[PDB]
Amino acid sequence: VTRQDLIDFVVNEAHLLDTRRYEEWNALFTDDAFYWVPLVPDQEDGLNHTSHLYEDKLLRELRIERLKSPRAFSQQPPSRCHHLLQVPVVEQFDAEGNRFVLRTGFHYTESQGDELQFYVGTFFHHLTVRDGALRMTLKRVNLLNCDAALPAVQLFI
Amino acid sequence: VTRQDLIDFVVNEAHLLDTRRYEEWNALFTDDAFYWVPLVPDQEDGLNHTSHLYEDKLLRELRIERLKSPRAFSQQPPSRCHHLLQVPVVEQFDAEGNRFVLRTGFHYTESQGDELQFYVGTFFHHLTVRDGALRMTLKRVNLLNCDAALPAVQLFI
Amino acid sequence: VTRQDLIDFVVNEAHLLDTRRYEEWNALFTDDAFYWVPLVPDQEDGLNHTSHLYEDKLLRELRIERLKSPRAFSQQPPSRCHHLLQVPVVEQFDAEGNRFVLRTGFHYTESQGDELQFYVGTFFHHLTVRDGALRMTLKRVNLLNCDAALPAVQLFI
Amino acid sequence: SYRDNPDAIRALVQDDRVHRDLYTSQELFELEQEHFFANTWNYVGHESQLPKPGDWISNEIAGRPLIVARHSDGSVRAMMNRCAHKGSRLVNGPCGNTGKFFRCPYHAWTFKTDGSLLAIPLKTGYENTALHECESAKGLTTLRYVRSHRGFIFVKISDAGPDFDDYFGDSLSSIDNMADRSPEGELEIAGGCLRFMHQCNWKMFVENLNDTMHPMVAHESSAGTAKRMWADKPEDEPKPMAVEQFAPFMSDYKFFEDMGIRTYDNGHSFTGVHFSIHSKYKAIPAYDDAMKARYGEAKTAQILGMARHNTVYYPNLTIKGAIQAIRVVKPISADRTLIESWTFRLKGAPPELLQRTTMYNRLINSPFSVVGHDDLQAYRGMQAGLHASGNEWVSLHRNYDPSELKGGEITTGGTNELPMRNQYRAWVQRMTETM
Amino acid sequence: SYRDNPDAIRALVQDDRVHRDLYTSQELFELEQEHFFANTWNYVGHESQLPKPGDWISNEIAGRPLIVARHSDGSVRAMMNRCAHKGSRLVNGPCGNTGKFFRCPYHAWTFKTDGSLLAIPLKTGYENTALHECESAKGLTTLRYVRSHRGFIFVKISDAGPDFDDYFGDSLSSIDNMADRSPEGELEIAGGCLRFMHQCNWKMFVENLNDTMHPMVAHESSAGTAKRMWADKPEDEPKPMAVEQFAPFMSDYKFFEDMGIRTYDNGHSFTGVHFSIHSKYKAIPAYDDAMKARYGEAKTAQILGMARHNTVYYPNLTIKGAIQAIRVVKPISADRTLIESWTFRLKGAPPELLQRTTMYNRLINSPFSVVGHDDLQAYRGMQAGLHASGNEWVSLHRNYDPSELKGGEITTGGTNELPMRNQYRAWVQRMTETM
Amino acid sequence: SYRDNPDAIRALVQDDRVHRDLYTSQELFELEQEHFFANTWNYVGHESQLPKPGDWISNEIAGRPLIVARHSDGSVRAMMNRCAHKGSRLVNGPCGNTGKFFRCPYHAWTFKTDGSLLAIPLKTGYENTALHECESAKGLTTLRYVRSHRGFIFVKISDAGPDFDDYFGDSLSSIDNMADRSPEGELEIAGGCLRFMHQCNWKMFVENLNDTMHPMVAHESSAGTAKRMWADKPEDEPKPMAVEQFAPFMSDYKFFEDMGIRTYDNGHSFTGVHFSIHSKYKAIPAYDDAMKARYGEAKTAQILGMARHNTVYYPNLTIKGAIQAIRVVKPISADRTLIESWTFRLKGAPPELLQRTTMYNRLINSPFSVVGHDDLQAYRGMQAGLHASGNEWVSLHRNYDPSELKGGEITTGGTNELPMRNQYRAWVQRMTETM
Ligand SMILES: O=C(O)Cc1c[nH]c2ccccc12
Ligand SMILES: O=C(O)Cc1c[nH]c2ccccc12
Ligand SMILES: O=C(O)Cc1c[nH]c2ccccc12
Ligand code: FES
Ligand code: FES
Ligand code: FES
Ligand SMILES: [Fe+3]
Ligand SMILES: [Fe+3]
Ligand SMILES: [Fe+3]
């Protein structure tokens, strides 16, 4: 409804990801929404081209549920993540058309044991209003070094 | 009095730390305030559990005064620090109760000679009003990798 | 005219630098403006002291034009850059005097191939109004480790 | 202390077990880079990556930078990425096109696309010298072991070892199937490349490919989770392709035992001789119609009934038949390896084939993949644990029988540990042949 | 060039001086990891960290990963964190509980808590093989040198060297005092662990423990600052515990000289035989009342009158008596070391004891501590400066006398440099015993 | 395998070509640090950096830390930055002022500014010991090869090799010109220092200095771009100093050939005997007036007409005459080097000279400079490409003639590759002298 509401939505989503509240984070998506991590710059779509992550509801639920398992050997000890965000910028704002697009620079840090890695890039958020609640229809994560060699990334960015 | 005043307070405190104006920075605390760096996540208190830093007025004064000594061998050449902050978020705002709580993501960089290190985490600020001036009653610094192996950290975070 | 315009100007300049729109970025400068990167902390001026970069219009045009050459051997493959900015702070605001000073903390990342480097520091922006458009008269880039040993930096910070 | 010490090289491998130094010793890694990887055929690329004349790609094999280029006559040539003057690289980047000649970016020496010298600027300075007697007069150093099969390019740095035909034997049929699933009989590179850095020796990754005992244990938290998540739904509802590709990992031991394994000489082996984990994968009618129109009923049935699980071309290539995806091993150090996963488009096929291939590639081979996380955790655990003392060996006794020492094409059950033993026999031979 | 060169190992140590290679040479560090740390008793943990059956902790000693676990019979066992199949770790993390058996996360081999083999999945594949003859049939490799004193667990990897009793002699009394300051006579681990990474060899940190000439010079900018800050205050006002713990560092030479030192065999030595820097530390009446009720008058006075400054158990443990804090040395490389500081809770004591212990630990051992900053700066300066040429020795001549070569328990003044000489004599012996 | 192998050291250099191991081998780098840089004179600083008594600077030469200080009598002394007690550094930082004595920050040993011992605290602990017989009694280890020419300070760690006068010969004239361009005949350090890390061996940087073949090829994208950007403007408009300094890089071949080159013994050589790229550089009337007032017409004309391009003092110093800028080479590893660029102020000259010098330094030597980017890319390409097999040599055949083997002062054309050959002959000699 207001721009500040969209900024708060993005900030609160990052905060929810930071405090391991995955069940609440996944509820912000629409049923047919996608969580997309492109593999190449200016990628056209996630259907005919490979990506790092192109998750629908089922795959997101699978990833969230695997973290609670006592046999997730790669998650012993569990990893921790931190998001540092630039202030979101509202690119398009269609109040009548029910389409909002936001661009946000991010620095993401992931640490496990005595190991730490960081990444930088941009979030593109597509938001709509369902029954008076703001909800995502697509979350695209553009990495600066998407096509470079990467180590294992075990948490949601 | 206003939220923007608290945001400006946090930003200006970081700026004061960055410019090496320690005498002005230490004056923002209350006489019984604490500068706390927990050692483990979700630490209960700094009394019955070890911490990286739990400083009252005397210890802060000692640390500030040691920096002016000509025999602080570990500070030759002097170190430099930089703070990069996400916009502060006001969680609790008790105008009548005189108690404010702020949460701020941070990226902190410290460099000496040809060596440089960085850390990420969250600041929790407890603020009150004394004689019309905003003053701190507790500064808690949550590090992402608090329980990991760390090198020497020689300045205020 | 308004502060938020100045914050938007700084943010948009960083965005223009991020998306390789050098021709539009160079048009924001005044004809006699300077792009200054000091070499020592609290450097007095860029005339009688060495600096990393002290570019007028001609040198900026030369650097921008060299990137389009098919024989820029050091730019194969091309490098990519990302800016993460703290919210700008307006120090001096002379509406009648036509001179504005802004201070912004920054984290800058540059990646080429499988190599990546990052720097932190402060931007000082001097802005004025020419024919109703905000334009820069000096862009000073204070690096935290300006006097330390550095590798090659091939893009605009 | 293995240098110039071949018997101590042989002593690290026994009939049914190996030593830990094969996974940790850095001096052994350097000796490999000097000896083993220079004496075997290694995948460097595909012909569809350099279609036009003058097109080139750059690769790195056994510590050597290589240019693989398309000469003006349409052939494929391989040369050292090293100028004849003072050693500077001629081409910077992964791929490109130089037109008619290479030009050094240091002093602008020029060479032909096949590597021969073309011109030296200011030649008047070399009249009374001895440049024309040295090897800098011949131009770039070339490789005369370059071969292509259905577009796949293999090179061999040195002249020691069996030739391409005897090196690969009859395993090439796998590649043929990968190429016979296209109505035009051609493959092209499309969909991008996934690059994954493992903090483990390359050997462990090469072993994980034909290990049927691991998936039900290590991959339980993900494959079992998916199986339980679907188990509930009506048996009539269509299975999402994610669940379709994830479910076979949690099969019982009899399934993998009956899948089968075949091994060739020189460490090449494939899994799934008769029926595999890619056997159901739904069905596409348009693709079947196209293949029927091109080949006929019998040939189409024969081709689509060949569903090998995965094939290993030692020491760096692995491929899948019905998925059209390959993986390449890029050793970096004793405890650092790089894995590259490519995908192919079949010429003339409907887009659903490529969509399925990209889905599988993202799900399995991405650095963000949970299956990759579990396998990498297993590799890291092995690398960390192999430093303990006491028991200093790695067991390869499963389904072992000395009659396998005769070699040749051997077919056996799915849980046999024969491929590892054959791999290490070949590795010992390839090191010791040139010491 | 020290490998298989024991005489050149002995040549780096003289009667009253040492060579610089003991602090810089990486090959010497590797030889130590193979020889020295495998021939001495090392602190791996406390019994209160694994109270219940099946409870385990994981440690890293001399380049070996170890599991220290509580067997079902209540004893403590030590084994290699390395599966018998192919080497993968069994447990990931610092501590945990496995119930009744260990299960490998690669192929689900299973072993008992004492390390013996329990079950191999799909055993039918090993009938006609030779698995049962090798050492993989026994299970995990175990350590039969595990001992406990008042809860402290010590291990020794190899079988060369004196046994626990003769190795430690009468220094164990220090530990006893640390345990006798509790009404229940028991310690537990509480308060967390501080981990500090030093860019210096572990040897310098081990020497700084019994060096009484350093504190008034290196620690001047902080301890002297505190002393001057508390100056001009009324003599009746209570001292903050920070000032109480900081003031003794800036004492005169006579204080430290009279404070005293005792040394044992095998590099074990404690400082402060008569009094110490922990002597005043105010007084708590409730704790004294409890100790009076449990022990009496004479025993309580004797226990609380024992105020050793700090004790060194070579090569990796140091403890404090009246503060209840220990430090462990974890060598990483020639120029990288990790120091871990733990704290104990005395059972049945008021919380003030633990509060004081945690305050001292934060003030002295934290990476944010100024005293640690100064000591680390001294270590880094020594590490950087020991690369200069010319004078290639380090002097240990202070208070040296040849009559100390008879060994045994020796008591002397506080500024003596005897402990370092004894440490290096023991280090030479432990190196050369297994050459 | 070069240690104690002088013949294999000689075998890597031939008359007109060199081996690749001179640029990659790490063991060769360590042997150099032990032998080569200890047997040649190296630039450690200028006298204007330490004008007052007690002023010191700290440097790092051949893996040794050094203190260069001004004694109380006004002379310049050099000592090891290593305390005589246990090796800790005495001074931390790049420069400073110690007053009358050095005081160790570990145990407060004290030494005189010339390095001799002054006082040991609590000396009463050394009466019956052997401290006074060892080398710790003399104090810091000193260097007796310290020499100064027009303020430049050169040191030589060891006693093997020719002395300063015979080592440098007549190349010192270059320095004299750099100092004769000041009305007072004095230089001072001003403007700051630029530090640039190159991921290449130092040898490549040292070779790029006298290579006239490269600038019109590698530096084309920048110098040619500037030339084309200016080409258009009226010939009467003043050229910006950026274009003035950039244009000469894109000259034809005859210009560089006629520019000229002179070489001395021991690898010292300068470029531009007749004219140079700094020849035009506009003109300043006030500076000429002052020089005329100080020297006269003839002497000023002779001094200002001497415009050498750049001079190389082997193995780590290069200078420019008419620009008043120097560069120092700081090797770090086989593939890591640090380059420092300083500027000088001429005493009594107008500020325009220093403004021009700082502009040139920023334009050419900064890590943000495009010319530096191109040169570093060439170095990195050479370092990466010298690992290819086959041709394992680097050609130095350009303008080669055996009559150059007589040595001495040799003058020749600008494109001759003689300086590199002389450099490598001197390098071979300096290695093999101490084998
Ligand atoms: O090809 C794959 O999807 C992964 C994989 C490698 N080795 C395997 C053995 C059994 C089952 C799956 C795999
Ligand atoms: O135990 C301490 O608090 C630190 C310390 C280590 N060595 C010392 C020698 C003398 C005085 C204090 C210490
Ligand atoms: O002196 C300079 O500005 C750079 C430089 C190094 N070597 C050269 C050879 C020819 C021309 C310029 C240079
Ligand atoms: S290195 Fe290629 S032309 Fe000189
Ligand atoms: S490595 Fe443990 S079961 Fe195979
Ligand atoms: S190391 Fe210098 S006084 Fe001891
Ligand atoms: Fe696997
Ligand atoms: Fe100390
Ligand atoms: Fe150059």
PDB file of C-alpha atoms in Angstrom, chain F residues 254-369:
ATOM      1  CA  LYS F 254      63.365   4.142 -35.298  1.00  0.00           C
ATOM      2  CA  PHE F 255      62.785   6.546 -32.400  1.00  0.00           C
ATOM      3  CA  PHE F 256      63.435   3.896 -29.753  1.00  0.00           C
ATOM      4  CA  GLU F 257      66.300   2.415 -31.779  1.00  0.00           C
ATOM      5  CA  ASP F 258      68.045   5.799 -32.004  1.00  0.00           C
ATOM      6  CA  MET F 259      67.302   6.660 -28.360  1.00  0.00           C
ATOM      7  CA  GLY F 260      70.272   4.542 -27.294  1.00  0.00           C
ATOM      8  CA  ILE F 261      71.420   2.350 -24.406  1.00  0.00           C
ATOM      9  CA  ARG F 262      74.542   2.104 -22.238  1.00  0.00           C
ATOM     10  CA  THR F 263      75.511  -0.808 -19.989  1.00  0.00           C
ATOM     11  CA  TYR F 264      78.109  -1.089 -17.216  1.00  0.00           C
ATOM     12  CA  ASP F 265      79.460  -4.038 -15.269  1.00  0.00           C
ATOM     13  CA  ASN F 266      77.447  -5.798 -12.550  1.00  0.00           C
ATOM     14  CA  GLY F 267      74.096  -5.337 -14.282  1.00  0.00           C
ATOM     15  CA  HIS F 268      73.887  -1.534 -14.038  1.00  0.00           C
ATOM     16  CA  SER F 269      72.577   0.117 -17.179  1.00  0.00           C
ATOM     17  CA  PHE F 270      70.778   3.232 -18.355  1.00  0.00           C
ATOM     18  CA  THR F 271      68.617   3.957 -21.380  1.00  0.00           C
ATOM     19  CA  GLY F 272      68.531   7.070 -23.548  1.00  0.00           C
ATOM     20  CA  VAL F 273      72.119   8.196 -24.089  1.00  0.00           C
ATOM     21  CA  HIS F 274      71.263  10.707 -26.859  1.00  0.00           C
ATOM     22  CA  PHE F 275      67.663  11.732 -26.113  1.00  0.00           C
ATOM     23  CA  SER F 276      64.673  10.266 -24.295  1.00  0.00           C
ATOM     24  CA  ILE F 277      60.915  10.323 -23.810  1.00  0.00           C
ATOM     25  CA  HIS F 278      61.372  13.074 -21.190  1.00  0.00           C
ATOM     26  CA  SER F 279      63.166  15.364 -23.645  1.00  0.00           C
ATOM     27  CA  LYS F 280      60.453  17.887 -24.518  1.00  0.00           C
ATOM     28  CA  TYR F 281      58.437  18.268 -21.280  1.00  0.00           C
ATOM     29  CA  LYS F 282      57.839  21.990 -21.984  1.00  0.00           C
ATOM     30  CA  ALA F 283      60.106  24.457 -20.132  1.00  0.00           C
ATOM     31  CA  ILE F 284      60.004  26.456 -16.892  1.00  0.00           C
ATOM     32  CA  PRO F 285      61.663  29.909 -16.977  1.00  0.00           C
ATOM     33  CA  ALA F 286      62.055  30.500 -13.226  1.00  0.00           C
ATOM     34  CA  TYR F 287      63.838  27.182 -12.664  1.00  0.00           C
ATOM     35  CA  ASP F 288      66.232  27.963 -15.519  1.00  0.00           C
ATOM     36  CA  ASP F 289      66.830  31.445 -14.096  1.00  0.00           C
ATOM     37  CA  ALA F 290      67.695  30.021 -10.673  1.00  0.00           C
ATOM     38  CA  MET F 291      69.985  27.381 -12.188  1.00  0.00           C
ATOM     39  CA  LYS F 292      71.731  30.071 -14.247  1.00  0.00           C
ATOM     40  CA  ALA F 293      72.153  32.206 -11.129  1.00  0.00           C
ATOM     41  CA  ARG F 294      73.705  29.287  -9.244  1.00  0.00           C
ATOM     42  CA  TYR F 295      75.862  27.579 -11.896  1.00  0.00           C
ATOM     43  CA  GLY F 296      76.070  29.751 -15.014  1.00  0.00           C
ATOM     44  CA  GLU F 297      75.076  29.379 -18.638  1.00  0.00           C
ATOM     45  CA  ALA F 298      77.430  26.563 -19.654  1.00  0.00           C
ATOM     46  CA  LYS F 299      76.955  24.378 -16.574  1.00  0.00           C
ATOM     47  CA  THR F 300      73.169  24.817 -16.607  1.00  0.00           C
ATOM     48  CA  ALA F 301      73.015  23.935 -20.306  1.00  0.00           C
ATOM     49  CA  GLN F 302      75.166  20.848 -19.719  1.00  0.00           C
ATOM     50  CA  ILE F 303      73.101  19.712 -16.722  1.00  0.00           C
ATOM     51  CA  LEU F 304      69.657  20.245 -18.250  1.00  0.00           C
ATOM     52  CA  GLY F 305      70.689  18.650 -21.552  1.00  0.00           C
ATOM     53  CA  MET F 306      71.431  15.345 -19.808  1.00  0.00           C
ATOM     54  CA  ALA F 307      68.105  13.514 -19.961  1.00  0.00           C
ATOM     55  CA  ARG F 308      68.611   9.770 -19.494  1.00  0.00           C
ATOM     56  CA  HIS F 309      65.404   7.747 -19.751  1.00  0.00           C
ATOM     57  CA  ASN F 310      65.892   5.481 -16.749  1.00  0.00           C
ATOM     58  CA  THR F 311      68.788   3.882 -14.887  1.00  0.00           C
ATOM     59  CA  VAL F 312      68.961   0.429 -13.301  1.00  0.00           C
ATOM     60  CA  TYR F 313      71.178  -0.275 -10.296  1.00  0.00           C
ATOM     61  CA  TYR F 314      71.056  -4.048  -9.929  1.00  0.00           C
ATOM     62  CA  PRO F 315      69.343  -5.804  -8.239  1.00  0.00           C
ATOM     63  CA  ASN F 316      66.633  -3.595  -6.696  1.00  0.00           C
ATOM     64  CA  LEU F 317      66.913   0.103  -7.630  1.00  0.00           C
ATOM     65  CA  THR F 318      65.841   2.151 -10.633  1.00  0.00           C
ATOM     66  CA  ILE F 319      65.838   5.936 -11.014  1.00  0.00           C
ATOM     67  CA  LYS F 320      64.774   8.645 -13.455  1.00  0.00           C
ATOM     68  CA  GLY F 321      66.876  11.751 -13.990  1.00  0.00           C
ATOM     69  CA  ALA F 322      64.613  14.541 -15.234  1.00  0.00           C
ATOM     70  CA  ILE F 323      61.522  13.369 -13.311  1.00  0.00           C
ATOM     71  CA  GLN F 324      63.179  12.800  -9.909  1.00  0.00           C
ATOM     72  CA  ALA F 325      61.427   9.517  -9.144  1.00  0.00           C
ATOM     73  CA  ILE F 326      62.821   6.147  -8.082  1.00  0.00           C
ATOM     74  CA  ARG F 327      61.425   2.632  -7.782  1.00  0.00           C
ATOM     75  CA  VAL F 328      62.555  -0.075  -5.357  1.00  0.00           C
ATOM     76  CA  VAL F 329      62.039  -3.819  -5.803  1.00  0.00           C
ATOM     77  CA  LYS F 330      60.988  -5.853  -2.746  1.00  0.00           C
ATOM     78  CA  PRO F 331      60.839  -9.574  -3.585  1.00  0.00           C
ATOM     79  CA  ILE F 332      58.387 -11.567  -1.466  1.00  0.00           C
ATOM     80  CA  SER F 333      58.180 -15.015  -3.060  1.00  0.00           C
ATOM     81  CA  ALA F 334      58.606 -16.727  -6.414  1.00  0.00           C
ATOM     82  CA  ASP F 335      55.281 -15.249  -7.582  1.00  0.00           C
ATOM     83  CA  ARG F 336      54.894 -12.178  -5.356  1.00  0.00           C
ATOM     84  CA  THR F 337      56.777  -8.869  -5.468  1.00  0.00           C
ATOM     85  CA  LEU F 338      56.273  -5.432  -3.911  1.00  0.00           C
ATOM     86  CA  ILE F 339      57.234  -2.243  -5.766  1.00  0.00           C
ATOM     87  CA  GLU F 340      57.685   1.078  -3.965  1.00  0.00           C
ATOM     88  CA  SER F 341      57.812   4.403  -5.811  1.00  0.00           C
ATOM     89  CA  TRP F 342      59.211   7.501  -4.097  1.00  0.00           C
ATOM     90  CA  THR F 343      59.524  11.107  -5.221  1.00  0.00           C
ATOM     91  CA  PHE F 344      62.111  13.763  -4.418  1.00  0.00           C
ATOM     92  CA  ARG F 345      61.912  17.508  -3.934  1.00  0.00           C
ATOM     93  CA  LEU F 346      64.820  19.535  -5.287  1.00  0.00           C
ATOM     94  CA  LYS F 347      65.969  22.084  -2.723  1.00  0.00           C
ATOM     95  CA  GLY F 348      65.460  25.686  -3.820  1.00  0.00           C
ATOM     96  CA  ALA F 349      63.371  24.901  -6.911  1.00  0.00           C
ATOM     97  CA  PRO F 350      59.900  26.298  -7.703  1.00  0.00           C
ATOM     98  CA  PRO F 351      56.938  24.039  -6.850  1.00  0.00           C
ATOM     99  CA  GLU F 352      56.212  23.249 -10.516  1.00  0.00           C
ATOM    100  CA  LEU F 353      59.015  20.665 -10.554  1.00  0.00           C
ATOM    101  CA  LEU F 354      57.482  18.708  -7.677  1.00  0.00           C
ATOM    102  CA  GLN F 355      53.991  19.090  -9.141  1.00  0.00           C
ATOM    103  CA  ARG F 356      55.188  17.564 -12.419  1.00  0.00           C
ATOM    104  CA  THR F 357      57.009  14.774 -10.575  1.00  0.00           C
ATOM    105  CA  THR F 358      53.938  13.861  -8.517  1.00  0.00           C
ATOM    106  CA  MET F 359      51.726  13.934 -11.617  1.00  0.00           C
ATOM    107  CA  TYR F 360      54.042  11.525 -13.435  1.00  0.00           C
ATOM    108  CA  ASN F 361      54.270   9.258 -10.383  1.00  0.00           C
ATOM    109  CA  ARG F 362      50.485   9.068 -10.070  1.00  0.00           C
ATOM    110  CA  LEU F 363      50.012   8.506 -13.800  1.00  0.00           C
ATOM    111  CA  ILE F 364      52.592   5.723 -14.196  1.00  0.00           C
ATOM    112  CA  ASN F 365      53.327   3.994 -10.887  1.00  0.00           C
ATOM    113  CA  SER F 366      49.972   3.926  -9.081  1.00  0.00           C
ATOM    114  CA  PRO F 367      48.025   0.666  -8.644  1.00  0.00           C
ATOM    115  CA  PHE F 368      45.140   2.583 -10.261  1.00  0.00           C
ATOM    116  CA  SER F 369      47.220   3.329 -13.373  1.00  0.00           C
TER     117      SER F 369
END
